[PDB]
Structures are given as C-alpha cells and as structure tokens.
Design a protein around this ligand. Structure first.
Ligand SMILES: CN1CCC[C@H]1COc1nc(N2C[C@H]3CC[C@@H](C2)N3)c2cnc(-c3cc(O)cc4ccccc34)c(F)c2n1
Ligand SMILES: CN1CCC[C@H]1COc1nc(N2C[C@H]3CC[C@@H](C2)N3)c2cnc(-c3cc(O)cc4ccccc34)c(F)c2n1
Ligand SMILES: Nc1nc2c(ncn2[C@@H]2O[C@H](COP(=O)(O)OP(=O)(O)O)[C@@H](O)[C@H]2O)c(=O)[nH]1
Ligand SMILES: [Mg+2]
Length: 169
C-alpha cells in the first residue's frame, strides 16, 4: 500500500518530462509539451516492496504562490535534474535545492542529483563537478540519458531508497 510522492525539478529543457515519461511509458518522448506541469502514478516493485510512485513533473511559469509552496511541500523526495551539456542548468541546482529546503523547513530532505543527456558528446559539466556538488549536499549523483533510458530506473529507485533511509533516521 506504500506510496511515495516524488517531484522532478530543474531548469527548462533538462529532460524532466523525458525522464518521467521513460519511467511511466518506457519510451523516449522527444517533444513533450514544454509548458505543461502534470503528474503520473505508477506501481513498481523496488527491492521486493510494491510501491506506488506519484511523480510531479514540474514546468511552467516561475511563481511562488502559497498554493504552490503547499503542494511542493507534500513531496517526499526530489530529483534535482540538470543536463550535462548545459552549465546554466547545473548552476540552477542550488536554487531548486534551496526552495525545497525552504518549503520543507528542513536541512535533510531526500534528494538525488541527476545529470541527464549523458548520451550527448557536448559535455560542459564534468562528472567531477557533479560528484563534488552531490557530496557537498550529502546526496547521491546519478548520470542518466532519457533518450536511451540509461540510469532512469536507478535515479527514481535511488530516490525511493533515500526516502526509506530518511524515514528511519
Ligand atoms: C531566475 N530563476 C531563479 C533562479 C533560477 C531561475 C528559474 O527558477 C525557477 N523557475 C521556475 N519555473 C520557471 C521555468 C524553470 C522550471 C519551470 C518553473 N519552468 C520555478 C517554479 N516553481 C518554483 C517553486 C515554487 C514554489 O512556490 C515552491 C518551490 C519548492 C521547491 C522547488 C521549486 C518551487 C521554483 F523555485 C522555480 N524556480
Ligand atoms: C496551476 N495548477 C494547475 C491547476 C491547479 C493549479 C495548482 O496545482 C496543483 N494544486 C494542487 N492542489 C492541492 C492542494 C494545495 C493547493 C490546492 C491545489 N489544494 C496539487 C496537489 N497535488 C499535486 C501532486 C499530484 C501528484 O499526482 C503528485 C505530486 C507529488 C508531489 C507533490 C505534489 C503532487 C499537485 F501537483 C498539485 N498541483
Ligand atoms: N539527447 C538527449 N536529448 C534529451 C534527453 N532528455 C531530453 N532530451 C531533449 O531535450 C529537450 C527537452 O526535454 P524535456 O523532456 O522537454 O525537458 P523539460 O523541459 O525538463 O521537461 C527535448 O528536445 C528532448 O528531446 C536526453 O537524455 N538526451
Ligand atoms: Mg517538461
């Protein structure tokens, strides 16, 4: 009966929707509407536990209404997504992590840093940069390609494992 509320955050264009749709539908959607914030639930078995993952794929205007703080605060774990070919997207990770900490009122929120578009040759964020950042935050780092599905399950399932560890602290 276990359910996990997950939220996928990060800059426009990093592949949040492509990652979400790989998990939900098992294919690469090349051009999912860039403006649309939507959610999807999927039943999975992770380490033998049947789970319902209820995933919010964020999008749309930058706004900070009380309603948005309220529903964002119900997230139990967050994927911090950047793209390895886009330094600006990596530089935005700090902001998303701070907004999560702000609404959850905690220094300890389950998160995973996700470096997407790992299939692309035009790398401008080194793996070491991402590892150093994740280490500084105390969280895992997972390299993904929504295009090929590399790492997708690992990113979501690692986030579930982080939530489990948080629950038992
Ligand atoms: C100049 N900007 C500040 C530096 C980085 C840059 C963009 O920042 C930014 N952009 C957004 N959008 C615009 C683009 C990018 C992604 C989506 C949505 N399309 C955000 C939307 N909601 C939230 C948020 C609102 C909230 O009430 C509570 C939150 C809790 C956790 C995480 C996010 C929350 C944000 F922080 C956004 N930040
Ligand atoms: C501009 N928006 C599009 C039209 C509506 C407007 C607001 O959007 C919006 N409002 C809500 N309200 C619930 C509470 C708090 C404020 C109001 C409205 N009463 C959401 C609730 N849950 C989720 C969600 C669903 C889900 O399946 C998985 C989630 C995982 C983590 C966090 C939230 C999740 C959402 F996305 C909500 N979004
Ligand atoms: N090569 C490559 N392209 C990707 C990958 N993920 C997303 N894209 C492309 O990057 C663009 C933005 O993806 P989208 O899922 O809309 O990003 P979002 O704005 O974060 O939801 C689209 O053109 C996608 O096809 C990936 O892992 N590899
Ligand atoms: Mg999207």
């Amino acid at each position: 009966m276990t359910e996990y509320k997950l939220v996928v955050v990060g800059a426009d264009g990093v592949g949040k929707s492509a990652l979400t749709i790989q998990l939900i539908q098992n294919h690469f959607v090349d051009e999912y509407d860039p403006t649309i914030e939507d959610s999807y639930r999927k039943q999975v078995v992770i380490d033998g536990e049947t789970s319902l993952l209820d995933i919010l794929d964020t999008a749309g205007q930058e706004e900070y209404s009380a309603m948005r703080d309220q529903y964002m605060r119900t997230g139990e774990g967050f994927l911090l997504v950047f793209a390895i070919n886009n330094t600006k997207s990596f530089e935005d990770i700090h902001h998303y992590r701070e907004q999560i900490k702000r609404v959850k009122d905690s220094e300890d929120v389950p998160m995973v840093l996700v470096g997407n578009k790992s299939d692309l040759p035009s790398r401008t964020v080194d793996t070491k940069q991402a590892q150093d950042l994740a280490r500084s935050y105390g969280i895992p780092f997972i390299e993904t390609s929504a295009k090929t599905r590399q790492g997708v399950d690992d990113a979501f399932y690692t986030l579930v494992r982080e939530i489990r560890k948080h629950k038992e602290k």
